[PDB]
Amino acid sequence: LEELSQAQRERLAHIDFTLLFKGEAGRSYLTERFSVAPSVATQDFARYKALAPNNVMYDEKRRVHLKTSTFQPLFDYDIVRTLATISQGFGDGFLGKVRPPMACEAPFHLNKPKLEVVAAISEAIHKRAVINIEYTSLSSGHGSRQIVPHTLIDNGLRWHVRAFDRKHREFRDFVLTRISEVELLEDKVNDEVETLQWDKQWNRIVELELIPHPKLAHPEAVLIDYAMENNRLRVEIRAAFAGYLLRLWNIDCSKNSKSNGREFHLALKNPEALYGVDNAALAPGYS
Amino acid sequence: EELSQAQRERLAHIDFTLLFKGEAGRSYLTERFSVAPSVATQDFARYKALAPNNVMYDEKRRVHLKTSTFQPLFDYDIVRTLATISQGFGDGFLGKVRPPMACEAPFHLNKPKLEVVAAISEAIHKRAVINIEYTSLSSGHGSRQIVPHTLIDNGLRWHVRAFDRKHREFRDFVLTRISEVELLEDKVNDEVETLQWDKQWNRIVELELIPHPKLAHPEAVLIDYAMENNRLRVEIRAAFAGYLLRLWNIDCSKNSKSNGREFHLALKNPEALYGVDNAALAPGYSES
């Protein structure tokens, strides 16, 4: 299996995937996905049958290979990336719009940042550069400022950049869809103030204990849902994320689990862990 | 367009690297594509020919540089591209991948089991009935037959939209609470159990989102959500409305007067939620 070309492993994995997620796989799946010759696809299936003979049985009528009752995946899957592929499409995205390969929807996306804005911030992070941006903030409206970006973030809802803000001299999030212009500058980065190692809220990890909400009649449903152990799920997140994510995850973070207005499945067992976390007040019910 | 698919892919990876880093060298192509070192030069030459005003080789740095006049050679799927830079380069079928840059996506908790998602996807593809074990919030553990038709990545969990034969209704099942899946040979009643009869699924609700009225700077929300005429029109399946309005933190109360949650957006027309099952999950929504 490891003697093969990268291209050959990718096409084998696509056979594995198609058998696992559809009932079946034929030469047309490989020629559509990879634009290989039909004769190449035939060799692919032969390599697959040789590597996993008990995974596939051939159907002579329709000329498709069928998933058996004893199927075991030939490869390990990145589950996050695999779920992105079935809900988005098969490429890396660089060759135009793609579409999901199955009846799968992901309706939670609203608008995305502009390609050029994300690319420019990404470039500045890679080059360790200062950038001038225009930014329209909720707190003060439109303006300009210099920032020293260090990380791009897909948070639940929007994209933001974690950066040192030279306007107010603090590390801060900037929502990418509110960045209007990006200009790479030659100004020097102060590696004693402005770089990632000084970002305390970024570098502080908070250890959260999530438990089934006490009001639930069937907490065992939540134990299975979140793959909990010892009645809890331990999650470690950067303090700079805690507010965003606790609200996004709809976690009851009130002391007694009685401040609600919502329909919580999870409660934060140890709200003490949010002490000193900038923007913990975004977490539902946190006081 | 006259090139092989493998060659167009290598040209798109050059375009991406120049766009997202300042630069691109042969090592990026051999790492990503495992082509011979001599193949990468062929790629950059092909790229230089197709877009000469985008690149500028530096002999000392041994690297091709993005010019000030760069315009991407390809169109990008923005959702999938943002996924790739926050997840990694494969399709995911060859093992764990890692982001190609300083980019984090910290909102994922656990995912459904590979075999469970695959079994449901297979049943949807074959238009089959499945027996599942399911642990519900209302009744705990049990088993039932369901007729799945669509897989959903909602904001928070994955679910399958299906006809539930236990209570004879269309319904969501969270994939992480499905423990066993068994494909059946049982016949589907295409007059009761298929997608066309799923009313909440087929009903599209037309939401008008506006900057929240309590904001001092609504102009920040206007650029954020790319609004026009001070509103964003969003069309979603009724079966999604509750989930998504909560996930998006949209104020859906009649007279606002709701800012204990720091909303950036308000639902201008909560009348559009009447008769939507689980509208109650929408922040501040009150019908009766």
Residue numbers in the entry:
A (entry chain A): 7 to 293
B (entry chain B): 8 to 295
Task: Copy text from the publication.
The asymmetric unit contained four BrxR dimers, supporting our previous SEC data that indicated BrxR is a dimer in solution. The wHTH domains are exchanged between the protomers, such that upon exiting the wHTH the protein fold crosses to the other side of the dimer, to the WYL-domain. The WYL-domains do not appear to directly interact, but the C-terminal dimerization domains extend across like two left hands shaking, interacting through the opposing C-terminal domain through the palms, and with the opposing WYL-domain through an α-helix at the utmost tip of the protomeric dimerization domain (residues 202–232). The wHTH domains are spaced ∼25 Å apart in the BrxR dimer, indicating additional movement is required to optimize the positions for interaction with the major grooves of target DNA. Two sulphate molecules are bound within each WYL-domain. Nevertheless, the position of the two sulphates corresponds to a solvent-exposed basic patch formed by each BrxR protomer. Detailed examination of the sulphate binding site in BrxREfer shows an abundance of polar groups that have captured the sulphate ions and could theoretically recognize other small molecule ligands. These residues are found within the core β-strands but also the conserved loops, such as S143, S145 and S146 on the RT loop; K173 and H174 on the distal loop; and R184 on the 310 α-helix. We propose that ligand-binding at the WYL-domain basic patch could induce conformational changes to BrxREfer that relieve transcriptional repression.
Here, we functionally characterize a transcriptional regulator, BrxR, encoded within a recently described phage defence island from a multidrug resistant plasmid of the emerging pathogen Escherichia fergusonii. Using a combination of reporters and electrophoretic mobility shift assays, we discovered that BrxR acts as a repressor. BrxR comprises an N-terminal winged-HTH domain (residues 1–94), followed by a WYL-domain (so called due to a previous analysis of conserved amino acids), which has been implicated as a potential ligand-binding domain with a role in phage defence (residues 120–190), and a C-terminal dimerization domain (residues 200–295).
